[PDB]
Symmetry: D2
């Protein structure tokens, strides 16, 4: 297999990467960071998100693996001490692939840009008040006034979405979840309050009310967009694929990350 390895870049991660490369040299494994079939991320979830975005144009051809060199990362399945066992198992093709859903964000102006999110896409104002109309499948649902909005994938539900009161969703559910950031609610201004969970093929559109400039973040890459006509969220047709070598169920992963491990 062609493979590549990204590192967080501290001394620990860089040496783990060099040692795994040396270990891969003893098998029919070619290091190739243009067209890898296996992408190994060594670091944390931030490192793993950067790896996903480096290869977002070849998701259907890649299985990802995460090694956490600090504390547990949610997209990590290996500790550094297990890296040799990983090399051997990867080499012998001894794995099954697991797929998580992805979120597509489309930004239109006055022209379009699309982004793929593994965790979430959020939107805030570029300074002034944040006010958008929320339109669900072309039905006007609410006018949102507040700090911003967060649209999460299932595997993203344990990240920013969790901090905003959202529900944790198992990743086999093909859905996206919208959570509010500090909405205004009084007798004049009203939002639903609750997180909202949307299935595949529903489209959630945000439409400016006054200011048209927004800070849009996709997995914490945050970009100012000007003259925005619409921001459209839907579950992507594209999926990220994971190499899985043993059972590490999602709910155990949640348990280990939030309850005790």
């Amino acid at each position: 297999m062609k493979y590549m390895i990204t590192s967080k870049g501290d001394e620990k991660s860089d040496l783990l990467r060099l040692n795994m490369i040396a270990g891969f040299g003893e098998y029919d494994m070619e290091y190739d960071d243009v067209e890898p079939e296996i992408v190994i991320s060594i670091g944390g979830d931030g490192t793993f998100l950067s790896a996903f975005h480096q290869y977002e144009e070849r998701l259907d051809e890649i299985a990802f693996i995460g090694i956490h060199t600090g504390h547990l990362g949610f997209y990590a399945d290996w500790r550094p001490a297990e890296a040799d066992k990983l090399v051997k198992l990867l080499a012998k093709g001894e794995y099954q692939k697991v797929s998580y859903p992805l979120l597509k964000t489309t930004v239109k102006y006055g022209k379009e840009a699309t982004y793929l999110a593994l965790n979430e896409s959020t939107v805030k104002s570029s300074g002034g008040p944040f006010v958008v109309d929320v339109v669900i499948n072309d039905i006007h649902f609410e006018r949102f006034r507040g700090d911003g909005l967060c649209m999460s994938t299932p595997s993203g539900t344990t990240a920013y979405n969790k901090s905003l009161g959202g529900a944790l969703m198992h990743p086999s559910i093909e859905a996206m979840q919208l959570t509010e950031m500090a909405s205004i609610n009084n007798r004049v201004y009203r939002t639903i309050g609750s997180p909202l969970v949307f299935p595949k093929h529903h489209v959630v559109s945000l439409q400016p009310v006054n200011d048209k400039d927004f800070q849009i973040s996709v997995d914490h890459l945050s970009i100012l967009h000007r003259d925005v006509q619409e921001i459209r969220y839907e579950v992507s047709a594209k999926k990220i694929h994971f190499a899985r070598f043993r059972s590490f169920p999602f709910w155990r992963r949640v348990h280990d990350s939030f309850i005790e491990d």
Copy 2:
């Protein structure tokens, strides 16, 4: 079609029912409350939940319709003024069927009882402290200490689940959602806090820790169970079917019920 009509029993609902019966008499419609194919509920969501439980043994043979005689009911699609138009459309078979998921609860003792919920199943203590171990697909996930737990269907997400901070979920998603009621969280006792959303085929089991008596409510029918070994939640294979005569999208229904109408 065989049909029947349940009424909340106030003067308004009883007369609407008699007038609809008279209207049905002018078509090939037989009143039959043993084996109806159409069940019409006139009242509110409580009335509609009672209708569902009166016929839970023939869900695959029945389409339900709700008329709200007070303010909007979530399971209601008609106002009383539209009852004549309903009679005519029902008679001419001018409808499509829509299915919502259901929740199955199994209670084992030391012997089993199962219940079907359209909104939710909740569990509390019979007086003493409520303490259960939460086991997800045979994996011990947390020990819950607090007031109780609520497992909601998708259409139930807008009911008790909403009041407990849960996410609102579109009913095409085959899932159930677990929410906490006032858990204890300190350095000794820890729960996940967040609502949890489970797909079809996941089993959530509650296991007593000390007290074995629980008050279990299914759609607000609340029953004391003694000597409980286990309470198991899963998405039912059974579905409730609705007669639909026009588009009334779920998110518009949410909008009309919580934002403005």
Copy 3:
């Protein structure tokens, strides 16, 4: 000083109590559980709440001290290993007194009963729906529909109130805090949602709307009241007094109980 010692009653607490009694015998200390001036509670916060209610008729004549024999108790200032140092310091009168506010609950029928709470007073229905009008200083404020209501003292804010989303309040603030349990909020039914913090001399009255039977709990002593006309909450004029031998600030106590220790 006259003193007494209550024990949780496990082997550990009973022996600690006997050893402290023996230690007190070596000083001008008389064991007296009718008119103690010092009440020592050995156990947990439940034990300490029982001690407070055993002596609620002599609060102005008593300083309380808590020993936690299990993990940290919020009303506890001593570990069991420090009991000897406690005996010596108590005996030599080497302490300052600290006062926390208390909550008064009055229940009227059709006749009155009053209770004093150190943590909180809550109200629920005796089975049926819970619906009360909330009246603040004779001003109708909201009609509450839901599971119940919790009125907390400042030192109670870290207990049930915390689990219900309430704010943690420093105990020098003479106030009470009202929190909701799972209110219904839709276009027909509306509550404030937020916790409410009331100063001394404000009166919060709950008035039945339909059912007149309520389960009222004061520090987890829960009693059915029938034919209730009114439930009135106000900050008590009475205060619980603590013996303090060293600085153990409230916010450090919070830190140690919820963050790390």
Copy 4:
């Protein structure tokens, strides 16, 4: 009395102001915007906050009055139709003064700046991750990681603080309330979660952990501070004073603004 009138500046507010000025001309009232004793704000709460900050250096010499020309403003006690009755009552000195507490924020660098807030002071990062140590009366209480923090006065509790889950506090309570914005909570990172309510003379200090640049907002005036050593919050010794001409209790004001009016 010397008085001045600020207007939101729309046609409606400017004409109300001119008509009130004309009405004041018929009494012993001098228009003076350098040293007014009465400051009348015509507009909304934003207008009223701007009036407060225009005169923050003479709070002990000023009574404020608010007129809301749009929907109810929380700092507003008059509708535009009552402006004549206001002029007459103000002129004849027919009023009592009411005082609300204020929040003092001190920012130190490496040099100090202080600000007075009527609603709240918030702190966020200037872009990068927000990470501060929270120190309460020189006791390290938690390391906060998340979007930011909000410190609210009592009258501010119904504003941003409310949107962040904070408790609503009656303004006679001399306190400040700290609320979190989307904190990270997992097995590695822990915050208290709950709002915290501090009495007079407690000092809450925020200390940078890595990045030293912060966006600090005081009543929605938002300013970048660089090279920050510390941000200190305490209840101000200074108070804003209101002219009151009739009873309009705080809890009725809350009721009218959030429940119905």
